[PDB]
Nucleic acid binder design. Structure first.
Ligand code: HMT
Ligand code: MG
Ligand code: MG
Ligand code: MG
Ligand code: MG
Ligand code: MG
Ligand code: MG
Ligand code: MG
Ligand code: MG
Ligand code: MG
Ligand code: MG
Ligand code: MG
Ligand code: MG
Ligand code: MG
Ligand code: MG
Ligand code: MG
Ligand code: MG
Ligand code: MG
Ligand code: MG
Ligand code: MG
Ligand code: MG
Ligand code: MG
Ligand code: MG
Ligand code: MG
Ligand code: MG
Ligand code: MG
Ligand code: MG
Ligand code: MG
Ligand code: MG
Ligand code: MG
Ligand code: MG
Ligand code: MG
Ligand code: MG
Ligand code: MG
Ligand code: MG
Ligand code: MG
Ligand code: MG
Ligand code: MG
Ligand code: MG
Ligand code: MG
Ligand code: MG
Ligand code: MG
Ligand code: MG
Ligand code: MG
Ligand code: MG
Ligand code: MG
Ligand code: MG
Ligand code: MG
Ligand code: MG
Ligand code: MG
Ligand code: MG
Ligand code: MG
Ligand code: MG
Ligand code: MG
Ligand code: MG
Ligand code: MG
Ligand code: MG
Ligand code: MG
Ligand code: MG
Ligand code: MG
Ligand code: MG
Ligand code: MG
Ligand code: MG
Ligand code: MG
Ligand code: MG
Ligand code: MG
Ligand code: MG
Ligand code: MG
Ligand code: MG
Ligand code: MG
Ligand code: MG
Ligand code: MG
Ligand code: MG
Ligand code: MG
Ligand code: MG
Ligand code: MG
Ligand code: MG
Ligand code: MG
Ligand code: MG
Ligand code: MG
Ligand code: MG
Ligand code: MG
Ligand code: MG
Ligand code: MG
Ligand code: MG
Ligand code: MG
Ligand code: MG
Ligand code: MG
Ligand code: MG
Ligand code: MG
Ligand code: MG
Ligand code: MG
Ligand code: MG
Ligand code: MG
Ligand code: MG
Ligand code: MG
Ligand code: MG
Ligand code: MG
Ligand code: MG
Ligand code: MG
Ligand code: MG
Ligand code: MG
Ligand code: MG
Ligand code: MG
Ligand code: MG
Ligand code: MG
Ligand code: MG
Ligand code: MG
Ligand code: MG
Ligand code: MG
Ligand code: MG
Ligand code: MG
Ligand code: MG
Ligand code: MG
Ligand code: MG
Ligand code: MG
Ligand code: MG
Ligand code: MG
Ligand code: MG
Ligand code: MG
Ligand code: MG
Ligand code: MG
Lengths: 58, 211, 159, 105
RNA sequence: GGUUGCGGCCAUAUCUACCAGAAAGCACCGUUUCCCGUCCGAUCAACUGUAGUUAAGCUGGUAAGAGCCUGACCGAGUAGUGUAGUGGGUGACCAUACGCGAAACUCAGGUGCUGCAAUCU
RNA sequence: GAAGACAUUGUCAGGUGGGGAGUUUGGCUGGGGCGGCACAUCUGUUAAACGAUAACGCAGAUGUCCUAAGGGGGGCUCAUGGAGAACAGAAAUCUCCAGUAGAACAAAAGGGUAAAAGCCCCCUUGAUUUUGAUUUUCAGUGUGAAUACAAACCAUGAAAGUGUGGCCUAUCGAUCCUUUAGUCCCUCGGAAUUUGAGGCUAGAGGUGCCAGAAAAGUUACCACAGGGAUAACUGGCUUGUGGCAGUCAAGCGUUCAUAGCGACAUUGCUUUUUGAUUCUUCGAUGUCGGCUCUUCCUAUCAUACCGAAGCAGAAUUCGGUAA
RNA sequence: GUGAUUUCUGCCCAGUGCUCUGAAUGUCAAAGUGAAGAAAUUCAACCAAGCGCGGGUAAACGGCGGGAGUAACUAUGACU
RNA sequence: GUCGAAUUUGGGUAUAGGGGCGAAAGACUAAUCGAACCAUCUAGUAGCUGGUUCCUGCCGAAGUUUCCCUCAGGAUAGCAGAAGCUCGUAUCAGUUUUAUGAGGUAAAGCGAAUGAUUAGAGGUUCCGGGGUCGAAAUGACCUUGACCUAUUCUCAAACUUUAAAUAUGUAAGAAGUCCUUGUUACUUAAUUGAACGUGGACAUUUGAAUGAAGAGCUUUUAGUGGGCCAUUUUUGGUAAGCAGAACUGGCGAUGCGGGAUGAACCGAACGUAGAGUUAAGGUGCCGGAAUACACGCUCAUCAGACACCACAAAAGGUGUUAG
């Protein structure tokens, strides 16, 4: 008993009921997968200027 | 055991040439495509009449061949073997397949069965060149060949000089000038482009612009 | 059986451009990339390492990383009814800066100008783009140009 | 394949912790030992009646086995394993491939 | 403007044949003690700048030259194509309507532009 | 009387044991079966110029091979052809010119490559150690394969650099178990030492029906749940095959294409052939042949009336109206 | 097993069985033995029948070939 | 058939269910036999078949993805309901425009590469062979082949320099643009750069169109996981009311008007009704609606009569019509 094999029929109908949701956007995206040498330093860089800005409200 | 032409008249498939990929394919039943006085010069045979397809279809190699024999046969015995030049203008490069015949429709890929030329609307099938004074004789050749072919084709008098690419005067103007020079059965034209030097070598009878 | 390997179906796509094989010219490597830069993606078949997969060919993305011999580009691939974020480690031979924003930047730098150059005169600006408007009235003359009158032509064969 | 009987390579042995020379050799399994908990549990399981109490594999498909080389730091004494691709002839004798010689006689 | 070293775009820089090249520079060119490489100081290494030459390289110019680059209502609004109809046709196929639109062809024009540094009648 | 610590008997241990017990005896598939593998994969095409995309579609390939065929450096230029040199010839070795790759890069194919990615040489083990991210397939799981980094330790090179196996696109494997490597680490629960055992981290032993059962037949003596998701009989579409009819007219017919025929071609019809299909029927539409009997079709065998003939007659042949 | 009478029951013991006054230094369990160990245990030797080796058996199960050439026409093939 | 014996037969007696008994049929063992009958385990299991009980209201599917001894079943994602929650001119889009990429199909090409293919013409051989002169010749002369040059006819799913249309990525600002000059262990010859900032300058013509009965987010759950059809693209097949893909629109789940009829065509999508106007299709009569107007055409001893659709072809005509 052979039967149908494959079809994309109707599939974009379904895809469009509830979206094709756009891709969602953020200020400050994740540093995920960023060069560890950078990220290591960058941290200390940030820690510093933080300390500096507490130093502005002494 | 040949199937009726009917089974392959239309261009249902994509071109299936003989190839590395195909290979085991029979010979094309039609093997000569230029007959009559083909050695003849361009000047010899001014008039040119065509057999012209009015259909998008497929002509067998076998019907190509049969036709070829029909027209050449007529044209010679009525006007001689040196009267005319018949050019089959169509080569059967597309292989037709066959599902010859434990199994049934499981895995059904044909084996080569025969050849066919695939032909457009307006596409020339045969071409003939002669002396004007033979027109009737030629046209009767192509008319009889017609009976050998599926689909409607129609015979059309050319405006051109033989198998040349020029209508009758423009060839004349070019010839009674200097620009033309005889070749095997075709001809060569003087170009205004290229090395002046060996352009002057060839075509001596130009470069006065008169006789 | 079917075949669906990484570079499958890519015969012409990673092919090399007529009369353009061989070393890649050095400007490809002198070019510089910063995070936030928008690049276009195009595989250089001569460079097998660091290659984008075919799907990302002809795609534009944003750099999110800069490493020794590569940039990390992030593309939105839409799988299903939705986009997911994909991150591409491409070598620099497969990336170029997009001009997709050059007209914007040219537009802005220039919009700053005629904005000041108007204000500091006496307002009246108008600096949103507008679509092609229908054309206006006009008067075409005959002087030197009387209408030539064409008809349709008979049928003829030439062959 | 043919691989060398020796190998300058990383040794991760507290003191060694650097590239050293290893003596190379081919891994060979190891006698069974009842008293393995598994063999222990099995043996019990097979007592009394009921027959074979555990699957017995038949549908063999591979015609090879991945070679494992045992790499032994001649200084710091420690060993490391490193496993080759499937190959059908292995030897760590030698007879190295040679320049461009004649097919003899 | 020339030339050299380093270049960028990588034929309008390539190819074929011929001619012309001041000055500097490049070059060819002399040598084999030394480092260094060879079956061979041809390549490669070194030494001289002395003994010689524009012959070659190199640069430029010529050619109804090959190629290549650019352009055009040249071909062609052609081929092909998105959309439309209870349009034609036995079919094969084909017109029409609102759009998009090639390639070959043909004709003309062109034959490296240029960045940094040093040098030069 | 015989027999005698032997038989017998009791418990383990090996052999034997369809006499008997229990169970099993792949999937896809133009029905099933035989075959093949479309079952895990790779290249090119099908594929409709992003991506995706089917058939037992098309042409091929994979279960391997390499200590170099892996890594770095220098030098070199290939296939072919021309012209030349004792024996030497189509083909030996030597030279020069030309040479966009027409070669070579294990292998299928397609990409890719010229002071190289090819050929020759020099030095080598980065085919290594640590644990994450990422791309393909995707559920955005796993596995395979791959990519760019970080932390080591090295190789090469004057150096910039390059090197985390093979130029790129295939070449492969869960849980339980065994085994080995690792720190000298945790546990054996009344406290210790020592064997032994158990844990942790990383490997190997393999599942190819490749997300991974441990598996032979027969049944016409046969059984049940179902299936018209599926064959065998009628019926439907198709008409290749079968059958029947044309057009063209080279030939055949003493001569003469068409009285009667007719090649090479080529257009059709038919549904008493056989195929192809699987739409109807599997809570059942009685299968072949004959007998009997009715009716219909005509592509007419006879019979009525005709036209044609290579129709003298006679006989025949061809054609019309005709069932 | 075969199936009255008459007649006749050919060749084959390689296989599968069945069977044996057979051989022996091959394999081979539990117990027992020895060796190491602190013992648990590990290793070893010895080793019953069986297997293997050898013999018998077809009115046991069953089996009982292929290719060339060759005689004064051809054909055929006693013969090779 | 047999009928004086291996004869028939009463009663009594023995043999019992993996058992008996069998002159052997899987026969017979109380209408039960390829394992009797009775109770019980037992409401055995069932991916299979059947049925599943009131109304109205709102919303409203799938036959696809991936894994499965998986193919009449499951899990998984999708589609569906529900409950909402945080916000609100906000932010949103099966759409255009503009700017900037990607692509190798259609076409085209072949006197452009690869591969096919018809024809001559001109060359070149110390050299593929033939032939005349010859003692030969690296001899001359004819010759047919191969090659070369410039031409010629024809082709490609697995060829190609070129190269569309349709489809396709990104961008069109407050998360923006510019100035000043802090932090660090990264990085530079270098306070050089890189990243993250502090302080300062410019508002809705703040940076195209059109729309927005708002936008965003969370949880949980059904059914489904046989699909079929039409136009176009398209593979296998002679073909199919055949088999298999692409995009959309449908039928399935849907009546209503039309196509007499009919799942899918054309029109148009449904709360109860009035009046109007229409669609597709029609208006001789059946039958609501001109036996309307106008120009031609056509006479068939098997005329013709409206898409899908319910077929006809080559070939012929001194019928007639216009060219
Ligand atoms: C192969 O033969 C059969 O299958 C015979 C039969 O059993 C007919 C016997 C039915 C009864 C028992 C009623 O006689 C049967 O099932 O018939 C089906 C059956 O039985 C009623 C009807 C079928 C299916 C539709 C009509 N057809 C006719 C009879 C028949 C004959 C066949 C056949 C099938 C059928 C079936 O295959 C070959 O020849
Ligand atoms: Mg099935
Ligand atoms: Mg089906
Ligand atoms: Mg299905
Ligand atoms: Mg078509
Ligand atoms: Mg087809
Ligand atoms: Mg069958
Ligand atoms: Mg068949
Ligand atoms: Mg097959
Ligand atoms: Mg096949
Ligand atoms: Mg015809
Ligand atoms: Mg031409
Ligand atoms: Mg494929
Ligand atoms: Mg190159
Ligand atoms: Mg690599
Ligand atoms: Mg016990
Ligand atoms: Mg140790
Ligand atoms: Mg000088
Ligand atoms: Mg020396
Ligand atoms: Mg020298
Ligand atoms: Mg030197
Ligand atoms: Mg000179
Ligand atoms: Mg120079
Ligand atoms: Mg030129
Ligand atoms: Mg056209
Ligand atoms: Mg179109
Ligand atoms: Mg139409
Ligand atoms: Mg048109
Ligand atoms: Mg005793
Ligand atoms: Mg038994
Ligand atoms: Mg049994
Ligand atoms: Mg099956
Ligand atoms: Mg099956
Ligand atoms: Mg079958
Ligand atoms: Mg099979
Ligand atoms: Mg399948
Ligand atoms: Mg499978
Ligand atoms: Mg695609
Ligand atoms: Mg997919
Ligand atoms: Mg290759
Ligand atoms: Mg180099
Ligand atoms: Mg390894
Ligand atoms: Mg994995
Ligand atoms: Mg794989
Ligand atoms: Mg290599
Ligand atoms: Mg595999
Ligand atoms: Mg250990
Ligand atoms: Mg202890
Ligand atoms: Mg404890
Ligand atoms: Mg205890
Ligand atoms: Mg301890
Ligand atoms: Mg211990
Ligand atoms: Mg295992
Ligand atoms: Mg499986
Ligand atoms: Mg899993
Ligand atoms: Mg599987
Ligand atoms: Mg099994
Ligand atoms: Mg059984
Ligand atoms: Mg029986
Ligand atoms: Mg038929
Ligand atoms: Mg037929
Ligand atoms: Mg037929
Ligand atoms: Mg003829
Ligand atoms: Mg006659
Ligand atoms: Mg005759
Ligand atoms: Mg018949
Ligand atoms: Mg059915
Ligand atoms: Mg049937
Ligand atoms: Mg039935
Ligand atoms: Mg019924
Ligand atoms: Mg009946
Ligand atoms: Mg009748
Ligand atoms: Mg009749
Ligand atoms: Mg006569
Ligand atoms: Mg008559
Ligand atoms: Mg009658
Ligand atoms: Mg009648
Ligand atoms: Mg017997
Ligand atoms: Mg008997
Ligand atoms: Mg007896
Ligand atoms: Mg005898
Ligand atoms: Mg004998
Ligand atoms: Mg025997
Ligand atoms: Mg023992
Ligand atoms: Mg036997
Ligand atoms: Mg029982
Ligand atoms: Mg019993
Ligand atoms: Mg009863
Ligand atoms: Mg009974
Ligand atoms: Mg129940
Ligand atoms: Mg029961
Ligand atoms: Mg099932
Ligand atoms: Mg609704
Ligand atoms: Mg499984
Ligand atoms: Mg069902
Ligand atoms: Mg979009
Ligand atoms: Mg393609
Ligand atoms: Mg094409
Ligand atoms: Mg074409
Ligand atoms: Mg072209
Ligand atoms: Mg070509
Ligand atoms: Mg193409
Ligand atoms: Mg768009
Ligand atoms: Mg807006
Ligand atoms: Mg609005
Ligand atoms: Mg609102
Ligand atoms: Mg749900
Ligand atoms: Mg669900
Ligand atoms: Mg499924
Ligand atoms: Mg589900
Ligand atoms: Mg539709
Ligand atoms: Mg349904
Ligand atoms: Mg409806
Ligand atoms: Mg109706
Ligand atoms: Mg109708
Ligand atoms: Mg419509
Ligand atoms: Mg009526
Ligand atoms: Mg009425
Ligand atoms: Mg009126
Ligand atoms: Mg029509
Ligand atoms: Mg006609
Ligand atoms: Mg007429």
């Amino acid at each position: 008993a052979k039967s149908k094999n494959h079809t994309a029929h109707n599939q974009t109908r379904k895809a469009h009921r509830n979206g094709i949701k756009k891709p969602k956007t953020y200020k400050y995206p994740s540093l995920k997968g960023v060069d560890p040498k950078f990220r290591r330093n960058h941290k200390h860089a940030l820690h510093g200027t933080a300390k500096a800005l507490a130093a502005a409200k002494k | 055991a040949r199937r009726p032409a009917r089974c392959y008249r239309y261009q249902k498939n994509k071109p299936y040439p003989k190839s590395r990929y195909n290979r085991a394919v029979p010979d094309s039943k039609i093997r000569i495509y230029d007959l009559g006085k083909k050695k003849a010069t361009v000047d010899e045979f001014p008039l040119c009449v065509h057999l012209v397809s009015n259909e998008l279809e497929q002509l067998s190699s076998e019907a190509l061949e049969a036709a070829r024999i029909c027209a050449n046969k007529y044209m010679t015995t009525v006007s001689g073997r040196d009267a005319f030049h018949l050019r089959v203008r169509v080569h059967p490069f597309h292989v037709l397949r066959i599902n010859k015949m434990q199994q049934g429709m499981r895995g059904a890929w044909g084996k080569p069965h025969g050849l066919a030329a695939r032909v457009d609307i307006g596409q020339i099938i045969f071409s003939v060149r002669t002396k004007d004074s033979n027109k009737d004789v030629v046209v009767e050749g192509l008319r009889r060949a017609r009976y050998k072919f599926p689909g409607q084709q129609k015979i059309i008098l050319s405006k051109k000089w033989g198998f040349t690419n020029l209508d009758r005067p423009e060839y004349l103007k070019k010839r009674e000038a200097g620009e033309v020079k005889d070749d095997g059965a075709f001809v060569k034209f003087l170009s205004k482009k290229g090395s002046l030097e060996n352009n002057i070598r060839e075509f001596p009878e130009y470069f006065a612009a008169q006789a | 059986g079917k075949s669906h390997g990484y570079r499958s179906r890519t015969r012409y796509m990673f092919q090399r451009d007529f009369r353009k094989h061989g070393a890649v010219h050095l400007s490809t490597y002198l070019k510089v990339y910063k995070v936030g830069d928008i690049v276009d993606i195009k595989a250089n078949g001569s460079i097998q390492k660091g290659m984008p997969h075919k799907f990302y060919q002809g795609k534009t993305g944003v750099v999110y990383n800069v490493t020794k011999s590569s940039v990390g580009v992030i593309i939105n691939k839409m799988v299903g009814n939705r986009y997911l974020e994909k991150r591409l480690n491409l070598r620099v031979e497969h990336i170029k800066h997009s001009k997709c924003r050059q007209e914007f930047l040219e537009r802005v730098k220039a919009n700053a100008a005629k904005r000041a150059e108007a204000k500091a005169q006496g307002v009246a600006v108008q600096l949103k783009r507008q679509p092609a408007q229908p054309r206006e009235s006009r008067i075409v003359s005959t002087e030197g140009n009387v209408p030539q009158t064409l008809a349709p032509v008979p049928y003829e064969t030439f062959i | 394949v043919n691989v060398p009987k020796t190998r300058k390579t990383y040794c991760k042995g507290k003191t060694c912790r650097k590239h050293t020379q290893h003596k190379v050799t081919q891994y060979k399994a190891g006698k069974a030992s009842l008293f393995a908990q598994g063999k222990r549990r099995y043996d019990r399981k097979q007592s009394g009646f009921g027959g074979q109490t555990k699957p017995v594999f038949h549908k063999k498909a591979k015609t090879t086995k991945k070679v494992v080389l045992r790499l032994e730091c001649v200084k710091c004494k420690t060993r490391a394993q490193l496993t080759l691709k499937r190959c059908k002839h292995f030897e760590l004798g030698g007879e190295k491939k040679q320049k461009g010689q004649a097919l003899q006689f």
